[PDB]
Amino acid sequence: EVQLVESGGGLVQPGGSLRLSCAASGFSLSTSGIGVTWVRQAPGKGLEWLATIWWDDDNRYADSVKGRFTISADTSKNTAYLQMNSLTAEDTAVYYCAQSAMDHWGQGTLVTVSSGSDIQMTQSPSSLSASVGDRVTITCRASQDISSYLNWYQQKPGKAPKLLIYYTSSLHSGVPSRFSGSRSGTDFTLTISSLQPEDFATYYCQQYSKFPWTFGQGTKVEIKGS
Amino acid sequence: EVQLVESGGGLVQPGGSLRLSCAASGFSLSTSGIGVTWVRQAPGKGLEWLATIWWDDDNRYADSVKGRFTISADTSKNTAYLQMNSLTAEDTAVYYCAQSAITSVTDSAMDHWGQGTLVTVSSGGGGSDIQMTQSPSSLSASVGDRVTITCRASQDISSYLNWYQQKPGKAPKLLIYYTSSLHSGVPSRFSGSRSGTDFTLTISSLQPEDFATYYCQQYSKFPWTFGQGTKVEIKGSH
Numbered sequence: 001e002v003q004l005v006e007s008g009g010g011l012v013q014p015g016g017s018l019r020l021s022c023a024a025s026g027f028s029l030s031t032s033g034i035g036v037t038w039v040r041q042a043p044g045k046g047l048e049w050l051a052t053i054w055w056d057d058d059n060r061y062a063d064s065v066k067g068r069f070t071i072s073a074d075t076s077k078n079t080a081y082l083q084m085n086s087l088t089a090e091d092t093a094v095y096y097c098a099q100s101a102m103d104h105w106g107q108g109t110l111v112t113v114s115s116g117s118d119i120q121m122t123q124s125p126s127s128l129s130a131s132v133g134d135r136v137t138i139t140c141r142a143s144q145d146i147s148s149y150l151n152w153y154q155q156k157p158g159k160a161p162k163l164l165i166y167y168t169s170s171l172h173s174g175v176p177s178r179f180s181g182s183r184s185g186t187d188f189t190l191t192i193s194s195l196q197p198e199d200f201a202t203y204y205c206q207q208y209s210k211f212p213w214t215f216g217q218g219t220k221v222e223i224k225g226s
Numbered sequence: 227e228v229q230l231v232e233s234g235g236g237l238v239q240p241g242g243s244l245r246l247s248c249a250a251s252g253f254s255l256s257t258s259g260i261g262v263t264w265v266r267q268a269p270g271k272g273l274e275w276l277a278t279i280w281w282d283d284d285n286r287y288a289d290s291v292k293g294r295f296t297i298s299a300d301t302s303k304n305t306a307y308l309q310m311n312s313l314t315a316e317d318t319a320v321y322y323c324a325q326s327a328i329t330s331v332t333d334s335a336m337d338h339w340g341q342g343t344l345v346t347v348s349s350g351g352g353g354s355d356i357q358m359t360q361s362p363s364s365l366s367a368s369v370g371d372r373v374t375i376t377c378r379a380s381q382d383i384s385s386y387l388n389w390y391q392q393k394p395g396k397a398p399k400l401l402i403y404y405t406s407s408l409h410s411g412v413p414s415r416f417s418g419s420r421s422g423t424d425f426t427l428t429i430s431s432l433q434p435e436d437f438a439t440y441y442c443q444q445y446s447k448f449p450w451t452f453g454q455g456t457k458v459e460i461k462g463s464h
Contacts, residue, residue: 066312096398102400149332172337
């Protein structure tokens, strides 16, 4: 019977490195046609293929780990490895190895990368249709307290974003007074009092309470009828 | 009147390297390019912050570019840079630089932006990743029910599909390989089949040990890709 035994996980500080091991028994890594694969699963999420190494020493990798992870094997110890550099919280996951369909799996080893959580901005609506002269109201919800550290931008196709409002409610010079911003707790609102033709565009909120700076997904303000 | 002028984008092979430049005129960058920020926008998608030169010699980066991208500036040339290694198709985007306000912590907003430079990273001949779309995302059923789970590949993957079961705290378990072949030891009530782009996993009479999550997985091309999963749950557990 085949057994795969993983080790090497644990707590690692961001920017650090780890080497995971996958020790095989009941079969030999050097045998023609055998490969070992690494797959990971972030907490509460699905499965992500990372890398595969074959008897012939040929290997394949996933894009999300290009340049940072290296798969290898030691036939002498019948063990495969995953070297992981420049780790971040996005690499927190249970890491599995499997023999190759993937029939036999290791038990998993948890890698936790940490020293807070990224701030998520939930912008609504995704899109809206309106007419010239309408009042337009766009909102953003921060996943945690960000004080008043929120900006609003406008973007038109093919152009860079344009700053409208900073620090929740301060109108930047040159921006028309029909634009205003407010907040109530973690709920932020951009209001266009009377929509003008030049205001059809996409709008984004952006928090700067902490790094990473994060944007809402955008709201497209479109002409009624398309 | 200020202008930020970007250059350095173009077509890149997987694993390639670029250096984007952001040349300022009409004002002077402050020490070390403090406040210069890079933001990117993938085709049809939103804005993503990448990096800011910030105070106390602490450059700030998005996790997904840490160890690959480097931000720096040459104030004597009034130019800032984003150097990018280990590029992949996921990095295809218009890349913007901007100057964030630096005088008050109440305001780090970006008023002045470059025009953008397009970075297109090819797949080196591999084409686009195959997306597996699995449905339902969850379903509730009773012991004895017939359970039907489907997966759709974004392109033709022939018969190269496997089905896995996973229970909390355990590794995935292979149920079916090559679309319809049952693995030794899997109960007879499990079966898999194919039509065209769409694959089906069927449990003919749901048993208590079958409440679990199920995943499809294609191996037509690397990268191997999985469906998002289907959680099979007990009726009345909500």
